[PDB]
Amino acid sequence: AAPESFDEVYKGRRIQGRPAGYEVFVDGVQLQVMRNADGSWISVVSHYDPVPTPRAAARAAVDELQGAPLLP
Amino acid sequence: TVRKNQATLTADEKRRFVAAVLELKRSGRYDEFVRTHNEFIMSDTDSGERTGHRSPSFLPWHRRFLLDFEQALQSVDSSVTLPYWDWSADRTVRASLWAPDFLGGTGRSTDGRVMDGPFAASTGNWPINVRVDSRTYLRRSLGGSVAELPTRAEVESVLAISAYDLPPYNSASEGFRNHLEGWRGVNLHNRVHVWVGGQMATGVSPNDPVFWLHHAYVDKLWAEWQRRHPDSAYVPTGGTPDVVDLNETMKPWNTVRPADLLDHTAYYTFDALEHHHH
Ligand SMILES: [Cu+2]
Ligand SMILES: [Cu+2]
Ligand SMILES: [Cu+2]
Ligand SMILES: [Cu+2]
Ligand SMILES: [Cu+2]
DSSP states (O other): OOOOOEEEEETTEEEEEEEOOEEEEETTEEEOEEEOTTSOEEETTEEEEEESSHHHHHHHHHHHHTTOOBOO | OEEOBGGGOOHHHHHHHHHHHHHHHHHTHHHHHHHHHHHHHHHOOTTSOOSSSSSTTHHHHHHHHHHHHHHHHHHHOTTOOOOBOOTTTSOSTTSGGGSTTTTOOOBOTTTOBBOSSTTOGGGSSOOOOSOSBSOOSOBOOTTSSSSOOOOHHHHHHHHTOOOSOOTTOSTTOOSHHHHHHTSSTTOSHHHHHHHHOGGGGSTTGGGSTHHHHHHHHHHHHHHHHHHHOTTOOOSOOSOOTTSOOTTSOOTTTOSOOGGGTSOGGGTOEESOOOOSOO
16 A cells, blocks of 8 residues: 655755555665565665655655765 | 684785785676666565575575685685684774775775775775775775664674574564564664665675675674574575575575575685574
8 A cells, every 4th residue: 555646846956756566766766665564664775774654765865975966 | 614703804914815806806707796686686676586685595595696706716816715704803903904904994084985995986996896886996884874883782683593494584584584684673684784884784795805705794694593503494485475485596596595505604604603502
């Protein structure tokens, strides 16, 4: 049962999420994310640090990136 | 081959380790280790096939991956072995590990860039090629995203767990493997990745040479656990979908099983590893 979609500007960058199991984009570039058995999430730029939701993983990625473009 | 605590290396052993790592990087071989790790960590999932992570084979998989890397180092300089970082003892930014003659220090505050040591971007010798974003320089933020490394008492609580692993054999499991990996409990191995920050906190974490020293100590803790629990062994032992059973082979090598990797002494010993005792 998938999380809801989201779309917002976070620290100046557009973050979007949508069910697909779930896709996240940072300024239109896909951010790979993964769901853990307990329902938390990680992303490929925070792969050892569970956060509760795909939006939390998108925000953590924007924090980690410090303005840098994501690579596809 | 003896794997030694990084804190104990001589100046000549640090010099030789660094030079062998930099030659694997120059020749293009190093980056393929980064790529292999990222491919597995991105495909290992709690609900499907899982080999390198979030699964019982997390420990033999990283043991074989580290053996591949150590053999590549030895092809450059046969005297080099992988040292290990006991992060429960060497737990501050002041540890000699992070000195300019070894791994260099933390990243500067503006962009996380490591500014000293042999792997600093300014040397021209450590381009970050296998990456998830535009930045091509090594980054760290020691103690930035999580305040403390595990302590020895926390490690000892994990080492006291008797079962190797438990159904459902994933990040939800009770048992030693998942507590060492860190998805449940006081969190050992995942928290160290988070504590270093930079690339070490991402799927392309072998971009930081500390990756190997972290995993060599995780590997030593599996050896310590076996000494503590000579009566316990790898599970599962057959017919488990999506999970590598004891006698099944592991990707990417396909020609090795967890059973072939349980006894490290067939490949290396440690400077110190206590015998079984009570
Ligand atoms: Cu890993
Ligand atoms: Cu790891
Ligand atoms: Cu003996
Ligand atoms: Cu006994
Ligand atoms: Cu004892």
